[PDB]
Amino acid sequence: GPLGSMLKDVLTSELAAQVRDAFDDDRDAETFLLRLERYGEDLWESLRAVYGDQVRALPGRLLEVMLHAYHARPAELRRLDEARLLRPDWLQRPEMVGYVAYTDRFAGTLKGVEERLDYLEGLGVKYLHLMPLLRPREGENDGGYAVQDYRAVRPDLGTMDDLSALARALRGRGISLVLDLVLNHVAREHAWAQKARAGDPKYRAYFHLFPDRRGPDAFEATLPEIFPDFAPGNFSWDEEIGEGEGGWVWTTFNSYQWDLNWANPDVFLEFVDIILYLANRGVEVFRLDAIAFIWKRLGTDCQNQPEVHHLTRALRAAARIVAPAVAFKAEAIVAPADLIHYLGTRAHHGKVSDMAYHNSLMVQLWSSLASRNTRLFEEALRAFPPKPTSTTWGLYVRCHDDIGWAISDEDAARAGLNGAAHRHFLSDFYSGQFPGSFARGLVFQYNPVNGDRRISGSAASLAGLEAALETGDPGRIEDAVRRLLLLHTVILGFGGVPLLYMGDELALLNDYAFEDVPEHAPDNRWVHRPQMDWALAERVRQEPSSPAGRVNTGLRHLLRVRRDTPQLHASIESQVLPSPDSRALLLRRDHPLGGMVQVYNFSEETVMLPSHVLRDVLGDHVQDRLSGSAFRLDRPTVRLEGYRALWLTAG
Amino acid sequence: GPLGSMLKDVLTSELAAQVRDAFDDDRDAETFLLRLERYGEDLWESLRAVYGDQVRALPGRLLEVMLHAYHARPAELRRLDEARLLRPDWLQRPEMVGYVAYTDRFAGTLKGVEERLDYLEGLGVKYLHLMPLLRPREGENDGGYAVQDYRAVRPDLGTMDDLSALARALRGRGISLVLDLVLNHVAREHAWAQKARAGDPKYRAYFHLFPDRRGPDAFEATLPEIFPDFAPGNFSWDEEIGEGEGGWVWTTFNSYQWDLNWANPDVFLEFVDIILYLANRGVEVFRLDAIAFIWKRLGTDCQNQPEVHHLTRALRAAARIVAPAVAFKAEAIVAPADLIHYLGTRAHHGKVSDMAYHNSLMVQLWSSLASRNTRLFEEALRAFPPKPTSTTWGLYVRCHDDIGWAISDEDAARAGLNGAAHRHFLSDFYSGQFPGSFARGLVFQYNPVNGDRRISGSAASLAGLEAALETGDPGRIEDAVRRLLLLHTVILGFGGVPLLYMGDELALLNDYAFEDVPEHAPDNRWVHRPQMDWALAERVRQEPSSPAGRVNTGLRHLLRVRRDTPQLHASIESQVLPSPDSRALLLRRDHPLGGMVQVYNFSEETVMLPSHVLRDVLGDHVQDRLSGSAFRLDRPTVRLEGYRALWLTAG
Ligand SMILES: OC[C@H]1O[C@@](O)(CO)[C@@H](O[C@H]2O[C@H](CO)[C@@H](O)[C@H](O)[C@H]2O)[C@@H]1O
Ligand SMILES: OC[C@H]1O[C@@](O)(CO)[C@@H](O[C@H]2O[C@H](CO)[C@@H](O)[C@H](O)[C@H]2O)[C@@H]1O
């Protein structure tokens, strides 16, 4: 009513006054204010939902950080901001293609990356995700995920000026730089944590600290264990915490990764500042690492609490008021219905993030390759609510992490499977324990208490090439190559930005030499984080008939077809077309110029697919975009040899 | 290759040079240039597709017009431009609601409109389409569609400054001004046509002129007749054309409406200038009148030629490089597959328009109300390809025009009907010739050659209220009120901006006094273009139980529910859910927070709908957004009384 109204009035005019006072140039003030009007309600309501009445003390400090970032934003990045506002579906274009790499493994240093831009460009890459490259702690550092200083580049990669000069050279090729925002935890060596241990109460309040086992024991009753092999539980003992003998600190991941206290608005402020600082160095997309973990609540698994989406929305709104070019990409492993909350709900609240990993597509790809059965695939896809049309999936076959078999009991039961049995089969199969498995993966984080296993291994070793090369059997080598190409066809055709993992285009195998690096030995994820093989890159260019060569040639052809296929616009979602044959997966994409049906054989066997399931959708005459040829769907069957993919449209 | 490349290089740099030379302020030059980069390819490629090599001589003249419009654009409309770029889905929000009115009929003058803004705002209107208000020819002028001067307001409505002050007052209420761009033809009294008749060859070349019957006869062989009753055929004889005895001029519509020659790029230039001039007066959306007609080609019906979409795309691109707030709305009556080309194709060419009338929804609403059968409705909807998700339908129950029964033989045959028979039934039914019809419409443009009929009449008279009031039968009055509300429920729920026709909220009946105005008498469309009844508006506010009052109260309730229903976001399209009962129409809308099924009974009879068709989609427990109550879909049937609507979501 009036009392509440009047207070809100005073606040608005205080916000307006601080913005106008900050700009000598009135167009800038007007621009800032329009952005604040567009995103203000998402920013403040989200902040009040997490921080309650405290928020009222927040605007001056937060607007201070944003106003300065705005003044500090280079003219060329202001122009990028306008360009992105003019093309809001930029991530959704079929020409978009991503590439994911550790700087040091790909090209040694940031400047070395600049020397490989013709390689990325020759692949049609337009989105480059470099793995965490901020200064990490010395020694073991979870491959850069234990960050010591967010304002410096790891010194052996270069400097913040190299990062900025790299991003400028990327833009000159139409490539977007994409980096991790490691916002859930910092290295125990970060100055925040050093000061908490020295006793500074401002910085003790950045962490979740406990004098004894009571708090920790009470949380642990409902918490899972993420890295049982590295650091049991979710709390670590540290001698230097407090005045006396130490204390317990929350450490979800490694002991040297201290979870940040997101109930403290100072932490929110620090990360606004980090985001805007990195955006002004040229970062265009932020992958929100471990985003699900940022809110703790007693009695829950401390993942996916509602505050996570409020904080994410506020962080984004603050960022884009300053730098509208910036997009956010959530990585959260959660049930489909919940995953959609990381993107947006197309309701009275604003968008939460621009992209999210489609982890369930990745899991089903490997699951169906192992089982030769696509019914679980169909049911896992069918469980998703639709995303907002303006958001975009990131699709992948592999990445820097092990694979967890995130398959729901509910989807599995709809496909006539027991979930637990199927999940157990997938780890037996991909660790190579199941007889006749083609896969060569390593068990990661076996958990004795519950029997949970994840799998490490590169795409080529999981898909059969490492085993096929050992045998020297030409039929095994052929099938491994075809599986690798089928995997990459699905992520290229599914709708979303396909995120090629460095070297998958060369079919790189497990790197068992990680055991010989003490910093890596305990963590077998490093098996699928190889050095780039540039000699191999040159050999496949000159000799395309080898198995690496055929994966390379094949992937490059698929990339060219993807970019010329308008039906792949990511505003449209693939829908399951129920298959009459359990070896095949049929996906339909409706599009203004005519539908597409993508057809995939997940078996080494020749499937004679009954034609009517396709004819009913596309009519009697179709073209396959992938081979260029025709099919007549008036014949009774369509012949799909092992691992065949088709992208059919009418004609 | 190189020769072609080098020429394109020189052109680009000449375009860049002219833009930089034009701005003293470098941010403005950079902004202009970014927009030119974003839309240039759509602008020039579309122009070359229509005008070929001529286009090469075009940029300087076209950039001249755009550069000046950009300098002339008021700061507040530049801010509107930025606001719209920040909220690109602004037309798609469930809170959007449109209202369509003749200025003089609604409030007398432009300044009179400003006096009724509380009325529009109390309705939640956010989009105001005023009917053609540019200076028309004196006398009969097709209700403003015979424009004499695009740069002046009809003097009895006010001036261009009043139009601008009106638009500013609209923005202050969050209302977008929407006007017709009458781009296909001008009044024979327009200075262009006066000069063509005086002999100026520049202006003769703005029209399609013929010395004798040879050209006209050759075109007529494949042309339909739009207004057989007003002006036969598509050509008129004019004495003053040429030096000798006159000549033939192309006149699709009235004899006094001369079709513009869009094969002349000077005409394209004139309309860029008109659009940007009107955008700088505050116009936000342009309805492209008669857009289908703008390209003539011998041997075709001269509607919907490919050049129409190229010209429309170029016109839009030129407009939004200057004024990104501006959106275009196509009105074309064509097969579904073709209608989608007025919007966009989500391929390598840019968007053609932001909105298009969904004329087939309007036709099916009336068709099913007459037949009590929804199978044709289902099949007509099912024939549409999907629109680009970033475009928006405009939905309506009635408008300023008669109704043509645009029902395809193909949809009709899929519903078990003969198209020609059904179309003949609809004109018998709505002219009130069919025994027991509740409708009181008038035949418009009966065509003796082929028997084509269209229908004039206001919503309330077509839906039965005029006949019900004559009888004084309370059951007939009840049914007419319920039909009116059901009609408006469907357009409010369908997805898109509902375009309320002035006075439909008061249930205005046919105005038979049009026969007493000589300018109107021959054109019975004026029967459904009444004066606003402000006395009635005041009575229903104070006495809501009358039939007008119940339509009013009912519509206002539906408007409030629409705006609080996130599932109505126009990025999502309604899909047919096949109905087991031919009296009912079921539409499904998938949405991130959970699906909706809208259920409509198109019969006066009580339908006991089998529950499983709904339970299968939403589960056992639902809420109806329209009445607030619950249903249990585990019971065997759901009871729908006559004309019941439900908007069900899970719960
Ligand atoms: O533990 C969460 C699983 O899901 C993640 O994607 C993030 O939540 C993976 O964690 C991420 O974070 C950890 C800690 O920084 C790092 O080891 C992973 O590489 C990173 O992706 C984690 O496996
Ligand atoms: O003749 C075309 C039918 O479709 C239209 O929507 C436009 O093409 C209607 O025409 C429009 O234009 C004529 C001529 O200006 C005018 O009489 C209509 O009111 C207008 O909507 C036409 O009936």
Q: Which residues of B touch A592 (CB under 8 A)?
A: 340, 343-347, 385-388
Give the one of A34, A89, A386 whose C-beta lies nearest to B390's C-beta: A89
A289 is catalytic: yes
Which one of A92, A351, A593 makes the best mutation probe of the B interface by having the most chain B beta carbons within 10 Å? A593
Q: Provide the sign of the torsion angle of the four alpha carbons A429, A432, A433, A436, taken in this order.
A: positive
Write down the residue that tokens 């369908």 correspond to: B494
Q: Shortest CA distance to A538 belongs to which of A491, A506, A495?
A: A506
Q: Which residues in chain B are immediately followed by a break of C to N over 2.5 Å?
A: none
**Is B434 buried (19+), middle (13-18) or exposed (0-12) by CB count in 10 A?**
middle
Are B586 and B575 spatial neighbours (Cβ–Cβ below 8 Å)? no
Q: What are the Cα distances from residue A248, in Å, to A236, A238, A241? A: 5, 6, 8
Neighbours of B470 (CB within 10 A): 10
Are A225 and A157 spatial neighbours (Cβ–Cβ below 8 Å)? no
- Whole-number Å distance, alpha carbon B259 to ligand 2 midpoint, is 13
Structure tokens at B193: 């046509």
Neighbours of A476 (CB within 10 A): 17
- Whole-number Å distance, alpha carbon B95 to ligand 2 midpoint, is 29
Are A457 and A441 spatial neighbours (Cβ–Cβ below 8 Å)? yes
The neighbouring-strand residues paired with A249 are A209, A236
DSSP of B280-327: HTT--EEEETTGGGS---TTS-SSS-HHHHHHHHHHHHHHHHH-TT-E
Q: Three-state SS across B528-558?
A: HCCCCCHHHHHHHHHCCCCHHHHHHHHHHHH
DSSP of A392-406: EEEE-S--SS-B---
Neighbours of A20 (CB within 10 A): 12
Q: Would the CB atoms of A572 and B340 count as touching at under 8 Å?
A: no
Helix H segments across B146-185? Answer: 160-172
Domains and CATH numbers, chain A: 1-95 (1.10.1740.10), 96-184+262-572 (3.20.20.80), 185-261 (3.90.400.10), 573-651 (2.60.40.1180)
Are B320 and B313 spatial neighbours (Cβ–Cβ below 8 Å)? no
- Show the beta-strand stretches assigned E in B552-644: 575-576, 584-589, 596-601, 607-610, 621-624, 630-632, 637-640
Q: Which ligand 2 atom is the nearest neighbour of the CA of B293?
A: 8
Question: Letter for the amino acid at A202?
Answer: K
Q: Shortest CA distance to B460 belongs to which of B435, B488, B434?
A: B488
Give residues with Cβ within 8 angstroms of A32, minimum separation 6.
A19, A22, A23, A67, A70, A321
Distance of CA A559 to the CA centre of its chain: 20
The neighbouring-strand residues paired with B355 are B329, B392
Q: Are strands B392-395 and B497-501 parallel, antiparallel or unpaired?
A: parallel
Q: Shortest CA distance to B426 belongs to which of B400, B462, B458, B401?
A: B462
Structure tokens at A359: 């982890």
Q: Look at chain B and count its residues.
A: 651
**Is A159 buried (19+), middle (13-18) or exposed (0-12) by CB count in 10 A?**
middle
Q: Three-state SS across B98-148?
A: EEEECHHHHHCCHHHHHCCHHHHHHCCCCEEEECCCEEECCCCCCCCCCEE
Tell me the nearest-neighbour CA distance from B31 into chain A, angstroms. Answer: 8
Give residues with Cβ within 8 angstroms of A430, minimum separation 6.
A366, A370, A403, A437, A439, A441, A455, A457, A462
The torsion angle over the Cα atoms of residues A36, A40, A42 and A44, rounded to 10 degrees, is: 140
Q: Which residues of B touch A591 (CB under 8 A)?
A: 346, 385-386
Q: What does the DSSP 8-state code read for residue B456?
A: E
A225, A331, A379, A402: which is the annotated catalytic residue? A331
Q: Shortest CA distance to A247 belongs to which of A214, A208, A209?
A: A209
Distance of CA B46 to the CA centre of its chain: 23
Q: Three-state SS across A196-225?
A: HHHCCHHHHCCECEECCCHHHHHHHCCCCC
The H-or-E segment that residue A649 falls in is: strand A645-650
Task: Enumerate the active-site residues of B.
Answer: 289, 331
State the method: X-ray
Search chain A and give the residue with CA nearest B595. Answer: A385
Q: Is A410 helix (H, G, I), strand (E, B) or coil?
A: helix
Q: How far apart are the C-alpha atoms of B387 and B218, rounded to whole Å? A: 36
Q: What does the DSSP 8-state code read for residue A581?
A: S
Q: How far apart are the C-alpha atoms of B446 and A537, rounded to whole Å? A: 74
CA angle B80, B81, B85 (to 5 degrees): 115
Are A648 and A618 spatial neighbours (Cβ–Cβ below 8 Å)? yes
Q: Shortest CA distance to B120 belongs to which of B103, B97, B102?
A: B97
Are A39 and A350 spatial neighbours (Cβ–Cβ below 8 Å)? yes
Distance of CA A181 to the CA centre of its chain: 11
Q: What does the DSSP 8-state code read for residue B577?
A: -
Starting at the edge strand that comes first in sequence, how are the strands of the sheet with A247-250 ordered?
Answer: A209-210, A247-250, A235-238
Beta-carbon pairs below 8 A across chains A and B = 103
Cα-atom radius of gyration of chain A, to the nearest Å? 25
The H-or-E segment that residue A149 falls in is: strand A147-153
Write down the residue that tokens 């190409």 correspond to: A485
Are A642 and A601 spatial neighbours (Cβ–Cβ below 8 Å)? yes
Neighbours of B335 (CB within 10 A): 15
Structure tokens at B370: 């007459």
Q: How far apart are the C-alpha atoms of B558 and A450, rounded to whole Å? A: 54
- Show the beta-strand stretches assigned E in A166-280: 176-181, 185-187, 209-210, 235-238, 247-250, 257-259
Q: How far apart are the first and last CA of chain B?
A: 63
Q: Shortest CA distance to B169 belongs to which of B118, B220, B221, B245?
A: B118
Tell me the nearest-neighbour CA distance from A17 into chain B, angstroms. Answer: 18
From the CA of B454, which ligand is nearest?
A: 2
Question: Letter for the amino acid at A300?
Answer: T
Q: How far apart are the C-alpha atoms of B103 and B106, rounded to whole Å? A: 5
Question: Letter for the amino acid at B30?
Answer: E
The neighbouring-strand residues paired with B392 are B355
Are B351 and A569 spatial neighbours (Cβ–Cβ below 8 Å)? no
Give residues with Cβ within 8 angstroms of B102, minimum separation 6.
B130, B131, B143, B144, B400, B502, B529
Give the one of A35, A37, A344 whose C-beta lies nearest to B592's C-beta: A344
Q: Is B393 helix (H, G, I), strand (E, B) or coil?
A: strand
Q: Shortest CA distance to A331 belongs to which of A352, A359, A302?
A: A359
Q: Which ligand 2 atom is the nearest neighbour of the CA of B333?
A: 4
Q: Are strands A596-601 and A630-632 parallel, antiparallel or unpaired?
A: unpaired
Mutation choice for ligand 2 from B102, B145, B180, B358, CB with most ligand atoms inside 8 A: B145
Structure tokens at A181: 């925002």
Q: What does the DSSP 8-state code read for residue B56?
A: G
Give residues with Cβ within 8 angstroms of A121, minimum separation 6.
A173, A175
